[PDB]
Amino acid sequence: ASLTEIEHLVQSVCKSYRETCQLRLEDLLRQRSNIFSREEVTGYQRKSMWEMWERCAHHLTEAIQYVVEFAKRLSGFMELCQNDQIVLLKAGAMEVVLVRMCRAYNADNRTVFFEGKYGGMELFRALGCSELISSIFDFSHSLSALHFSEDEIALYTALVLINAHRPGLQEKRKVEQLQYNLELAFHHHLCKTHRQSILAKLPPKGKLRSLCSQHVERLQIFQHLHP
Numbered sequence: 001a002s003l004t005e006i007e008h009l010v011q012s013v014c015k016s017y018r019e020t021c022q023l024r025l026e027d028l029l030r031q032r033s034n035i036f037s038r039e040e041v042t043g044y045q046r047k048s049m050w051e052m053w054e055r056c057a058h059h060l061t062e063a064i065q066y067v068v069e070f071a072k073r074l075s076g077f078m079e080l081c082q083n084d085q086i087v088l089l090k091a092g093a094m095e096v097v098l099v100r101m102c103r104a105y106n107a108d109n110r111t112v113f114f115e116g117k118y119g120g121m122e123l124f125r126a127l128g129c130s131e132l133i134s135s136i137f138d139f140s141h142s143l144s145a146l147h148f149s150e151d152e153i154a155l156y157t158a159l160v161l162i163n164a165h166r167p168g169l170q171e172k173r174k175v176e177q178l179q180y181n182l183e184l185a186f187h188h189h190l191c192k193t194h195r196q197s198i199l200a201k202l203p204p205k206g207k208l209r210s211l212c213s214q215h216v217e218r219l220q221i222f223q224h225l226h227p
């Protein structure tokens with residue numbers, strides 16, 4: 001590996017993301033002034049927890065589809081044995097989604113883009129899990145504060161997935177290979193864009209994990225009931 005090949009990896013990771021980022025940043029931003037009227041909010045609040053579950057599950061299913069496509073477009077990823085490909089996605093896809101989420105988050109009025117407009121967290125009242133919902137908003141707020149760029153997301157979420165410490169891995173060292181190269185790519189690019197400052201300011205890989213497991217387990221009470 002040289003700097004030229006690292007930069008190729010960077011450029012590549014950033015192009016897989018672009019091809020799989022699901023929603024254009026520019027559409028997201030242009031629509032920040034498109035906010036739910038309190039009438040429309042009230043409409044969401046009257047819905048049963050189940051209707052809301054149906055919608056959220058669909059949006060999360062759709063989101064995860066894109067994360068998978070992203071990972072497939074990661075060099076090295078497909079070369080992995082298929083057991084490991086599962087292991088990584090099963091452990092990492094949700095975390096990546098929670099990270100991608102901040103693109104759709106407006107920190108200036110603490111709202112999120114949901115089904116065509118921006119709404120605050122009271123939109124989700126019917127689900128009856130506001131500690132989970134607020135913690136997600138806080139997590140997205142933290143990242144929006146860093147002004148986390150598209151390429152930073154690309155490189156950062158790649159490392160979320162490509163983690164050789166996931167229990168279950170058969171050919172661990174191949175993952176370390178990809179992991180190590182992605183860390184180099186990520187760190188290098190920070191220098192090139194003068195964003196060294198954010199590493200210290202990122203939420204701990206613990207924080208992402210305890211959010212996602214807390215998240216997945218309220219998902220799993222919802223899908224007990226109600227496939």
Ligand SMILES: Cc1cc(CN(CC(C)C)S(=O)(=O)Cc2ccccc2)ccc1-c1ccc(S(C)(=O)=O)cc1
Nearest residue numbers: 021022023056059060063100101103104112114218219
């Ligand atoms: C994935 C998603 C979800 C939501 C709905 N939920 C989050 C809000 C409550 C913030 S939930 O489903 O996760 C909550 C929930 C559901 C069930 C049980 C417990 C908890 C709203 C916007 C998105 C979204 C879609 C696309 C992008 S992208 C890549 O930029 O294009 C980013 C974000």
